[PDB]
């Protein structure tokens, strides 16, 4: 749908952009879980942007990618946020087993790395975040996939 292209000159800027993006997702206050697919090569900054989003809205503590556990649950001032790294998801099937269930059926926010691995089982994304990189700079394209995605992108305006 609508798109945003945003230059991120350095890591501080990535963290500031995560805080602004996560603040928009909280303020929208949706009943449906917000699906965010974080895309980009290894080292592009998907986990650093996730860190800026969670720490930016108040998480205190390390943001450890869930390499083997696949999903990490956060409770931030009462909002449930789920960070997924699906790289080691053998088959999407394994998803219907683990606790995924309740996470996609409540007023949560889900931030997903390697969403391709979950094709079929994972709910469709509301917004894709495609991160490109050069040295210590980045550029992110946000792409809306749903009506909610469109509303998220419109919120970035001035
Ligand atoms: N502008 C920037 N944005 C994000 N990460 C940056 C930036 N500049 C440098 N980095 C570095 O790049 C790495 C990003 O790694 P990570 O967030 O784990 O990536 P991914 O999850 O996509 O594999 C970190 O070591 C980080 O400090
Ligand atoms: Mg990738
Ligand atoms: Mg990562
Ligand atoms: Na993804």
Swiss-Prot record:
Pfam families linked to this entry: TsaE
Signal peptide feature range: none
Positions bound to ATP: 11, 43-48, 136
SS bonds (residue pairs): none
Amino-acid positions noted as binding Mg(2+) in the UniProt annotation, renumbered to this chain: 47, 113
Main location per the UniProt record: cytoplasm
Highest taxon, organism lineage: Bacteria
GO molecular function, one term: ATP binding
Gene Ontology biological process terms in this record: tRNA threonylcarbamoyladenosine modification
Keyword entries, A-Z: ATP-binding, Cytoplasm, Magnesium, Metal-binding, Nucleotide-binding, tRNA processing
Gene Ontology cellular component list: cytoplasm
This protein's record includes keyword Iron-sulfur: no
Subcellular location: Cytoplasm
InterPro entries linked: P-loop_NTPase, T6A_TsaE
Function according to Swiss-Prot or TrEMBL: Required for the formation of a threonylcarbamoyl group on adenosine at position 37 (t(6)A37) in tRNAs that read codons beginning with adenine. Is involved in the transfer of the threonylcarbamoyl moiety of threonylcarbamoyl-AMP (TC-AMP) to the N6 group of A37, together with TsaD and TsaB. TsaE seems to play an indirect role in the t(6)A biosynthesis pathway, possibly in regulating the core enzymatic function of TsaD. Displays ATPase activity in vitro.
PANTHER family on file: TRNA THREONYLCARBAMOYLADENOSINE BIOSYNTHESIS PROTEIN TSAE
Family: Belongs to the TsaE family.
Protein name: tRNA threonylcarbamoyladenosine biosynthesis protein TsaE
Source organism: Haemophilus influenzae (strain ATCC 51907 / DSM 11121 / KW20 / Rd)
């Amino acid at each position: 749908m609508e798109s945003l292209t945003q230059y991120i000159p350095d890591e501080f800027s990535m963290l500031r952009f995560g805080k602004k993006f996560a603040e928009i997702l909280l303020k929208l206050h949706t009943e449906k879980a917000i699906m965010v697919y974080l895309n980009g090569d290894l080292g592009a900054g998907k986990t650093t942007l996730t860190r800026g989003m969670l720490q930016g809205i108040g998480h205190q503590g390390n943001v450890k990618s869930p390499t083997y556990t696949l999903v990490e649950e956060y409770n931030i001032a009462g909002k449930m946020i789920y960070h997924f790294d699906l790289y080691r998801l053998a088959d999407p099937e394994e998803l219907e087993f683990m606790g995924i269930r309740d996470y996609f059926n409540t007023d949560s926010i889900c931030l997903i790395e390697w969403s391709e691995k979950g094709q079929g089982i994972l709910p469709e994304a509301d917004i894709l975040v495609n991160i490109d990189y050069y040295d210590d700079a980045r550029n992110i394209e946000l792409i809306a996939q749903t009506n909610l995605g469109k509303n998220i992108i419109s919120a970035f305006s001035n």
